[PDB]
Amino acid sequence: MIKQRTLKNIIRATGVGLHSGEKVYLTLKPAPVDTGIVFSRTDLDPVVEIPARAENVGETTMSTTLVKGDVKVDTVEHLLSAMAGLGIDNAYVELSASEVPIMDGSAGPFVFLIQSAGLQEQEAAKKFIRIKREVSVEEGDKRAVFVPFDGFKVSFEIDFDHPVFRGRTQQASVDFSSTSFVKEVSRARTFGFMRDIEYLRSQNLALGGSVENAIVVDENRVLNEDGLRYEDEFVKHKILDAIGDLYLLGNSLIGEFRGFKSGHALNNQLLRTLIADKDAWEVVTFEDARTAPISYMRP
Ligand SMILES: C[C@@](CCn1ccc(-c2ccccc2)cc1=O)(C(=O)NO)S(C)(=O)=O
Ligand SMILES: [Zn+2]
Numbered sequence: 094m095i096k097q098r099t100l101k102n103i104i105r106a107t108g109v110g111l112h113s114g115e116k117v118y119l120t121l122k123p124a125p126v127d128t129g130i131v132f133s134r135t136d137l138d139p140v141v142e143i144p145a146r147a148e149n150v151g152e153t154t155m156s157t158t159l160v161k162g163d164v165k166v167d168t169v170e171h172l173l174s175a176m177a178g179l180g181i182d183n184a185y186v187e188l189s190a191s192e193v194p195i196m197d198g199s200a201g202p203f204v205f206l207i208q209s210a211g212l213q214e215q216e217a218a219k220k221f222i223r224i225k226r227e228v229s230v231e232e233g234d235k236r237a238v239f240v241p242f243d244g245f246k247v248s249f250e251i252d253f254d255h256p257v258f259r260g261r262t263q264q265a266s267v268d269f270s271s272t273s274f275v276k277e278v279s280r281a282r283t284f285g286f287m288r289d290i291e292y293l294r295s296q297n298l299a300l301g302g303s304v305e306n307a308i309v310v311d312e313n314r315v316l317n318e319d320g321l322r323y324e325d326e327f328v329k330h331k332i333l334d335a336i337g338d339l340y341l342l343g344n345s346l347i348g349e350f351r352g353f354k355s356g357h358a359l360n361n362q363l364l365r366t367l368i369a370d371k372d373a374w375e376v377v378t379f380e381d382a383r384t385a386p387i388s389y390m391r392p
Contacts, residue, residue: 095219095379097182098392099123101211106202108194111168111283111307112156114300117190121206124183126217129343130176132159132166133187145169145186147341147365153358155298157338167192170357171283174337175203177345178274179212180389182219198282198306199322200333204275212392218378221386224348226373230362235354237363239373242349244386245269249331249352255286256313263328269336270388278336280322281329284308335360342368347377347386 100123107118124131130145141164143149151160156168172193176184178200186193196202229238248266252258267277285299285307293299303309308326309316323329335352338360352360367374379385 095382095385097126097215097217097219098180098212098389099125099183099215100181100207101213101392104206104210106194106196106206108196109301109306110190110192111195111198111301112298113167113190113192115190115192117188117192117194119189119194120185120187121210122185122187123213124185126183126215128183128185130173130181130184130186130340132169133185134164134166134191135187136189137164145173145341146343147361147368150341150361153356153361154296155293155357157341157357157361165191168195169193169341170334170337171195171198171200172203172337173340174274174333175200175207175279177336177340178269178279179204179207179271180345181207181212183215195283195301195306198284198308199330200279200281200337204279212390214392220344221347221377221379222342222344222374223377224346224367224374226370228363228367228370228373230359230366232359232362235356235359237353237355237359238351239346239363239367240349240351243347245346246349247332247335247352248349249328249335249355251328251331251352251354253286253327255288255310257310257315258327263325265325265328265332267329267332271390272388274336278329278333281326281333282306282308282322283330284310284327287311331355339364344376345387 134141152158159166252262
């Protein structure tokens with residue numbers, strides 16, 4: 094059978110919140126079967142735990158934020174994308190502050206942490222959610238769609254309307270597996286445009302962001318000395334974000350996601366739209382791993 098997995102060892106990292114600019118200590122720990130990914134605010138008394146589930150997404154302004162009462166865990170998407178990419182079903186994520194550290198702006202440092210801690214297979218069937226029929230959401234010039242597919246395909250289209258793109262809409266599609274996640278997605282960094290600084294300043298956002306942990310674009314060009322990791326790094330990051338936001342469903346999806354200028358808000362609305370359409374999806378397990386729809390790394 095296709096099994097659930099967790100981490101084999103505890104591992105630690107330090108960084109800063111992209112939006113808060115606050116130093117934060119992170120600890121990843123193994124967790125039991127059927128736990129999912131759970132964030133724990135160990136700086137609070139009492140300690141507050143927030144499951145990383147779509148229903149706990151309370152804010153989606155330039156990040157995905159989990160909320161339980163007055164307690165928040167911000168910017169969960171890049172970590173969650175790495176957990177999804179490596180097939181980590183269950184884990185605890187302890188934080189000393191309200192925001193996951195941004196690291197280098199990509200999921201690469203989280204792939205490092207997960208692979209260095211190692212994986213532990215658990216004796217429980219992995220439950221997948223399979224898309225049976227098309228579901229979509231649309232807010233203005235943004236749209237997000239699920240359609241059936243036997244695997245997990247993440248497609249994205251976005252026109253950034255900036256000179257670095259040479260007037261070309263950015264498009265990419267990834268046939269998801271742990272290997273294609275590592276190869277094609279994991280290292281794509283977050284990004285910002287200087288045209289948006291007044292907006293960010295006014296909302297006290299991106300306080301921890303710079304060329305050290307993000308691609309920064311001025312009126313003409315990418316400011317980062319070494320340029321881009323991928324020619325299509327911007328759209329590949331949008332795919333990284335979608336993988337992390339979609340993992341908040343609580344189960345790996347068997348289907349195709351198509352994003353059209355979509356972001357965190359619409360990603361969460363698509364999950365709520367899908368969940369509510371009870372006949373558009375089903376829960377499945379695999380007794381015979383030879384029919385597995387998605388290839389995950391072995392522990
Ligand atoms: C929502 C974004 C983007 C987050 N994000 C990153 C970087 C900056 C920034 C950094 C330095 C200078 C100016 C802006 C601002 C910001 O808001 C995402 O990556 N969320 O995970 S996105 C790429 O989808 O727009
Ligand atoms: Zn992102």
